[PDB]
Amino acid sequence: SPWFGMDIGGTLVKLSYFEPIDITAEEEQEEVESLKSIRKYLTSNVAYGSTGIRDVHLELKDLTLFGRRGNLHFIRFPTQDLPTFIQMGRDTVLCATGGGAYKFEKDFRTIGNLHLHKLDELDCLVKGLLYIDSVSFNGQAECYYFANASEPERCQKMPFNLDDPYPLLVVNIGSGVSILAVHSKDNYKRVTGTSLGGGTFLGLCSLLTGCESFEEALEMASKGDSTQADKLVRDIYGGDYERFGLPGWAVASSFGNMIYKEKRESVSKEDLARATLVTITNNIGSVARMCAVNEKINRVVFVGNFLRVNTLSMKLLAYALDYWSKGQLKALFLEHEGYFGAVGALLGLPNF
Amino acid sequence: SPWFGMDIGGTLVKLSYFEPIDITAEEEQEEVESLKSIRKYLTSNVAYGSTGIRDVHLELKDLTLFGRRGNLHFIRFPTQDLPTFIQMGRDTVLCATGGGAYKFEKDFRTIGNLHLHKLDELDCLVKGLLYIDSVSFNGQAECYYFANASEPERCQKMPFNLDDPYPLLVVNIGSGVSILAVHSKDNYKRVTGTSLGGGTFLGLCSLLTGCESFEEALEMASKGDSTQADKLVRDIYGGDYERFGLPGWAVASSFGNMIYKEKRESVSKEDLARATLVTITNNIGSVARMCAVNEKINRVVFVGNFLRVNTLSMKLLAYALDYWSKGQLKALFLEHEGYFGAVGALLGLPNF
Ligand SMILES: Nc1ncnc2c1ncn2[C@@H]1O[C@H](COP(=O)(O)OP(=O)(O)NP(=O)(O)O)[C@@H](O)[C@H]1O
Ligand SMILES: Nc1ncnc2c1ncn2[C@@H]1O[C@H](COP(=O)(O)OP(=O)(O)NP(=O)(O)O)[C@@H](O)[C@H]1O
Ligand SMILES: CC(=O)Nc1ccc(CC(=O)N2CCN(c3ccc(Cl)nn3)CC2)cc1
Ligand SMILES: CC(=O)Nc1ccc(CC(=O)N2CCN(c3ccc(Cl)nn3)CC2)cc1
Ligand SMILES: [Mg+2]
Ligand SMILES: [Mg+2]
16 A cells, blocks of 8 residues: 545645655555556656646655655646546545545545545644654755845845744635634634635636636746735825824725726736735735734744745735734744645555 | 706716706796706706716605705716816816825816815725715615625625714725724724725726726626636545535635646636626635724625625625635625715805
């Protein structure tokens, strides 16, 4: 049985795969071809079919797990393509989490004798986050922040120590947003959530610009000016409003300049992409800040795949949390941000 | 000098006008034609030019104000048309609030000898809200709620007593959203705000559907199904997720089903209008709930013109605040919700 951990989300399936590297002579002989073909197929390819991808840069090398040494691999593909994944399987114990572990339970059971063990999303994310930080990212920090996020000539990624990680506010940006308060290794709760998440960015961006992928949406946003679509404080007051500490550059109304027909006719797709990204990211930051104040937690870590190859949103979150909290809150990021549920699922394997 | 109160917002100008009804014989003789022509023009018309409207149903009759009896009138027009308003004036003491009192200060001063007194938006809104509730709406309650908002066969508008209105959370939904905590008649603060407000609804709706007015956007939304665009909890799990108390009907990702090209090709403009309305309204409710919990305030009153002729959003707010707060928070509404800043400005007249 290959060791796999699976997180079946609304948008992406994330898979963690432990590749043993201490295979003895006797162990190699006493393994079936189907297993050897799986291990070679996964380790000799970085693209699987048309839509599967191995994130090679995230691999943890020479990890000791369950008394064996091996490499931990991180693989993703669209949930829309799970039927292809299951069909390839039909031609073992699977620990699975995410909503799809429930939605697709019956489909996994079409693989003969497969034991499906559905694991709680919250337990998986927390256990996987604590585990990866504890083993380190091949000796480097798993957690980082943007130092001096207020000044762009100084703003720089820097490591952050989570050896005592409690308490922690975890903001999981997937299709929607879930916000978790973690008080200890066995004391954590879902605080609330918001439906304005990564699927809102991608869905609205696709409607507004015709982009066909997440990466294209980000590329458009990198070229745009959100202020062509948004109504700013200075658009309403003529400048700053210091009475309530609002700088003139703050957004007063997202897409608010689009009530004017002449402005809708002049706005570019790139402007609209950037306004969508800014709108969603600022709302996530603000909800995170309000939850952190209510939970009395000053460390806010962001996870999920909305922030994958998305430095714009990461820097916007770092700047916004620091600015609007007057320096009381710190935005934290993790290298394996999309995969903690899949790792936590894999870590449940000894229980079965 | 006619008695006027003006709130110049990012989208609409709101005007409160006190029409004296106790004019004596000597007072009528000793009034200039320009004044008599203004009073007759305002009281004999309900539409002013192409874009001005008198909200006749809101008129307060036989009010005693500043030692005189009169009628209080409520008038609105688009801020885009303020140049026409000022040009009509060029062919007195004006108490004005809103961002436009600052932005357009120099324009008002093109009216010879006009004294412009800019008044704080927060002071104006609070004073005007407390004043209107205190004088009543022609003997009826100014404040109401939706009783039994969970069951549609029973959900009904009912009066709410604000004789002791403190503490109160005021959610001002204009172009953006401002959230105020009111602890006493002289102790109140702006808690925070969100840029996802009425201008976001109108601007995004116009981009997505081509609607040309707020009223058309609402009419489209009344015919639509937001679930064609939104990804629900049941879309991700296959049903409810009781582990975190999430019903299957809850929105997990606003516009989240629009990441699929075939769904973007089948969605109607009415569906998109309704999803925009639901997205913006739920986000406002959630931010209001989080602020109410942090401020330890259980009465949340919604004002602004986003809710004008918008019963869908009002009922959604009433249902959502009650449901997600497990009955700890009550959504409150006010008949004069768009005009409290203009009234509060008028009430500043004795200070000048
Ligand atoms: N290759 C990609 N395809 C689609 N979306 C992507 C991709 N890369 C990054 N994203 C973004 O990542 C978000 C999904 O993040 P992810 O954490 O994998 O969520 P999910 O688990 O699949 N959904 P959920 O059920 O809400 O937990 C999408 O909404 C996009 O904004
Ligand atoms: N006739 C209308 N024209 C435009 N918008 C309308 C109209 N009626 C209702 N609305 C809605 O009301 C919102 C404006 O509300 P309002 O409270 O008057 O804000 P504002 O004061 O002009 N803006 P702000 O500067 O943010 O305080 C718009 O964003 C629309 O969603
Ligand atoms: C995998 C998964 O489950 N994803 C998920 C599921 C749900 C959500 C949204 C959420 O958590 N919601 C909905 C909005 N809410 C409101 C709304 C109006 C008010 Cl007045 N108050 N709260 C709070 C509760 C986010 C992501
Ligand atoms: C007439 C008027 O002034 N309208 C107005 C002005 C401003 C706003 C928005 C607002 O108040 N903002 C901006 C978002 N904010 C964030 C953002 C990211 C984080 Cl991390 N935290 N907070 C909080 C402060 C709303 C309406
Ligand atoms: Mg997920
Ligand atoms: Mg206003």
